[PDB]
From a paper:
The classical class I and class II molecules of the major histocompatibility complex (MHC) play crucial roles in resistance to infection and response to vaccines, binding peptides for presentation to thymus-derived (T) lymphocytes of the adaptive immune system as well as natural killer (NK) cells of the innate immune system. In contrast to humans and other typical mammals, the level of resistance to many infectious pathogens in chickens can be strongly determined by the MHC (that is, the BF-BL region of the B locus), at least in part because the chicken MHC is much simpler, with single dominantly expressed class I and class II loci.
Soluble BL2 molecules from the B2 haplotype were expressed in insect cells using Baculovirus, with the peptide attached via a linker to the BLB2 chain [it should be noted that, in contrast to previous reports, the N-terminal positions of the BLA and BLB chains are likely identical to those of HLA-DR]. Of the 4 soluble BL2*02 molecules linked to MDV peptides that were expressed, the one with a peptide from gE formed crystals that diffracted to sufficiently high resolution to determine a structure. However, both chicken molecules have a four amino acid extension to the first loop and second β-strand of the BLA α chain compared to HLA-DR1. In stark contrast to all reported mammalian class II structures and to BL2*19, the BL2*02 has a decamer core, with the structure showing side chains at peptide positions P1, P4, P5, P8, and P10 of the core binding into pockets, so that the peptides that were first analyzed with a nonamer motif were reanalyzed for this peptide motif; the decamer sequence predicted by Gibbs clustering corresponds to the core sequence found in the structure. The conformation of the peptide bound to BL2*02 shows a polyproline II helix as in mammals but deviates downwards just at P4 and then returns to the helical conformation.
Residue numbers in the entry:
A (entry chain A): 4 to 186
B (entry chain B): 6 to 22, 39 to 140, 146 to 200, 203 to 224
The structure:
């Protein structure tokens, strides 16, 4: 359409090993307004300004999640435990802003076209893991029913530094990785 | 602060009697021609298939796969459910639009424009970042004339933080005057950046 506001939720689980996950979010065109922390009943706005403009009663999402959990078990039963092939992610790595020496920037790792939406990013600078200040998004849908996810690393560009983002997808035989260096 | 409403609550499926299983539900408000028209959709997903959907222009659930058919028939049997769902397009969808409009529909973030010689120099790069909405026009002019032949643009890329970026490179061996012109809704006049 011309603009779309979308409430997107899911509940999923693995066996061997047994684990479950769920998600509830509001989205406007390609971007995320908020998601709910489903263990904490917390509305988490993607940008702080949004929480100064609007509110959302978080427990509604958790009540929806209980419905989705029941629907999952019913559809697993109705389908005779029907399942589908995993799709591994493709990765893009690019700075958020024009690169200047000694000017704070943010490196963006975008994992796309994967299923199911279970995937973690790990950042390295010159081969050493970096964690402080990293932000990871929740999983954003796609019309082809695959998913995508952003991770962000604050950094200060310096000549000869090499960054890497590695994505570990549920069930994958290994991580997929991409590297980037400031020009 | 006003409170957003749910766009929907998932309907309950009917039971008809290593591994991985996934169930998703999506509730969409489509805002067409500004406030003129709303189209409301529900979509129910199992693993990687949409089973059943609702389109307010139709007014009934429609199955997209045989697994969705018992579900559409079940829900379509409930007249009051269909009435309530049919009310969402001009109800919660428009309530949420009224709250959100000023900072989504009307969000405006200026692009940041850098022009950069690349290599000697065989390419000029016009890097445009940080803008919202994603619609933008970035063009190269040499000596006054727009260059279409030797221009390579990335797609407009989503940064995921409600900003977008694009890089537009002119393959050229330095005419005398190059300009990158950027037109964007956030700006009262276009940005013209000339290369030194």
């Amino acid at each position: 359409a011309r603009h779309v506001l979308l409430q997107a939720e899911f509940y999923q689980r693995s066996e061997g090993p047994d684990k479950a996950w769920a998600q509830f979010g509001f989205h406007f065109d390609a971007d995320e307004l908020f998601h709910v922390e489903l263990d904490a009943a917390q509305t988490v706005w993607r940008l702080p300004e949004f929480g100064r403009f609007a509110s959302f009663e978080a427990q509604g999402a958790l009540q929806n999640m209980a419905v989705g959990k029941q629907n999952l078990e019913v559809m697993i039963s109705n389908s005779n435990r029907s399942q589908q092939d995993f799709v591994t992610p493709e990765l893009a790595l690019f700075p958020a802003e024009a690169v200047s020496l000694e000017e704070p920037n943010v490196l963006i790792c975008y994992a796309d076209k994967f299923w199911p939406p279970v995937a973690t990013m790990e950042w390295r600078r010159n081969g050493a893991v970096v964690s402080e200040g990293v932000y990871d998004s929740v999983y954003y849908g796609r019309p082809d029913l695959l998913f995508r996810k952003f991770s962000y690393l604050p950094f200060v560009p310096q000549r000869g530094d090499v960054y890497s983002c590695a994505v570990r997808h549920w069930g994958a035989e290994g991580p997929v990785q991409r590297m980037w260096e400031p020009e | 602060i006003e409170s957003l409403s749910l766009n929907g609550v998932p309907n309950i499926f009917l039971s008809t009697k290593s591994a991985f299983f996934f169930c998703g539900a999506i509730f969409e408000c489509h805002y067409l021609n500004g406030t003129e028209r709303v189209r409301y959709l529900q979509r129910y997903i199992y693993n990687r298939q949409q089973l059943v959907h609702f389109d307010s222009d139709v007014g009934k659930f429609v199955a997209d796969t045989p697994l969705g058919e018992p579900q559409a028939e079940y829900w379509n049997s409930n007249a009051e459910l269909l009435e309530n769902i049919m009310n969402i397009a001009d109800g919660s969808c428009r309530h949420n639009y009224g709250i959100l409009e000023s900072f989504t529909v009307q969000r405006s973030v200026e692009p940041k424009v850098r022009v950069s010689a690349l290599q000697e120099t065989d390419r000029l790069a016009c890097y445009v970042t940080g803008f919202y909405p994603p619609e933008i026009e970035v063009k190269w002019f040499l000596n006054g004339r727009e260059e279409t032949e030797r221009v390579v643009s990335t797609d407009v890329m989503q940064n995921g933080d409600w900003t977008y970026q694009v890089l537009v490179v002119l393959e050229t061996v330095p005419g005398d005057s190059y300009v990158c012109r950027v037109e964007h809704a956030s700006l009262r006049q276009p940005i013209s950046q000339a290369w030194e």
